[PDB]
Write a protein that binds this ligand. Structure first.
Ligand code: ANP
Ligand code: 3EX
Ligand code: MG
Length: 286
């Protein structure tokens, strides 16, 4: 069935970001609750068609690890993407209430992200391009799914920054980037979720014993691309987790681990085995 603007009705607002705003909406004709992302773009009907046309491949993106697609259309200066409402929000949100995320959970998240990136790569030749905690959604059935990935080339072009980059050093420095870049974004996200805050600059020895100003733009990018990469603090994380993220945060994208390798890494194999009531822990956390 086709989706259109008048067939919808706002329930609440799920939040916004750089460029987009997302509503919890009811699709009157189906009765389905959906998340509707609106993206403001002043753009000629020729390209706004190609964008909508390119977004249709989302209908073919079905995975337990990828957020469901209902449909996409253009309204009034805004292209809408309608998707599965994830009643548990983004890991960004859960990080806020949770403070830290237990290594055991993170291992479950890691599994989802890898399988999800793998799905997008293997079955669609799509790289994510924007991996961070807010584009990893969770729900009450304990599912973990990726969203806001780079399906439509033209949309990418039409959106052509903030105070926190999850961009790999190679992408910060040029155009010489690709799927390895997502691995970095993951690594960083995990360290952030692991620790409780954005890992750059790394915490003082003090700040660490405590757990257990905001940087200038250039000052931060200059760190990412030129200082050694962040690390899980010794001691309170398994040696396997530490190696996992260290492999993700290698500065040279060709030396950096790839999806193949991470999938059979000690940490993943170990997390695969662990009995974790992710669902139970999530709701407990809310
Ligand atoms: N499908 C969804 N279901 C439930 N909540 C969602 C969904 N999509 C987005 N959200 C929420 O809406 C918030 C803002 O979404 P979004 O416009 O994509 O930007 P962001 O990921 O928060 N930050 P940014 O990537 O810098 O724009 C997210 O943090 C989620 O909490
Ligand atoms: O959200 C994006 N950027 O977030 C900044 C907004 O504040 C985004 O950037 C894209 C670039 C190219 N094609 C698509 C998207 C896309 N959005 C998107 C992609 C996939 C899905 C799957 C159905 C769940 C949902 C989406 F909303
Ligand atoms: Mg987003």
């Amino acid at each position: 069935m086709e989706l259109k603007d008048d067939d919808f009705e706002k329930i609440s607002e799920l939040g916004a970001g750089n460029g987009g705003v997302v509503f919890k909406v009811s699709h009157k004709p189906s009765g389905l609750v959906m998340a509707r992302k609106l993206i403001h773009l002043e753009i000629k009907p020729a390209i706004r068609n190609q964008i909508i046309r390119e977004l249709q491949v989302l209908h073919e993106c079905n995975s337990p690890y990828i957020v469901g697609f209902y449909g996409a259309f253009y309204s009034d200066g805004e292209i809408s993407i309608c998707m599965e409402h994830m009643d548990g929000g983004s890991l960004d949100q859960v990080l806020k209430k949770a403070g830290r995320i237990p290594e055991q959970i993170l291992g479950k998240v890691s599994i989802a992200v890898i399988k999800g990136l793998t799905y997008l790569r293997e079955k669609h030749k799509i790289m994510h391009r924007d991996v961070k905690p807010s584009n990893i959604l969770v729900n009450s059935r304990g599912e973990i799914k990726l969203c806001d990935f780079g399906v439509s080339g033209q949309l990418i072009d039409s959106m052509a920054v903030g105070t926190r980059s999850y961009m790999s050093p190679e992408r910060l420095q040029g155009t010489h980037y690709s799927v390895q870049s997502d691995i970095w974004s993951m690594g960083l996200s995990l360290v952030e979720m692991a620790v409780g805050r954005y890992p750059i600059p790394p915490p003082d020895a003090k700040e660490l014993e405590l757990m257990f100003p905001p940087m200038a733009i250039f000052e931060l990018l200059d760190y990412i691309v030129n200082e050694p990469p962040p690390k899980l603090p010794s001691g309170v994380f398994s040696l396997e987790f530490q190696d996992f993220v260290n492999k993700c945060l290698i500065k040279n994208p060709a030396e950096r681990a790839d999806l193949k390798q991470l999938m059979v890494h000690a940490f993943i194999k170990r997390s695969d085995a662990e009995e974790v009531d992710f669902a139970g822990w999530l709701c407990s956390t809310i």
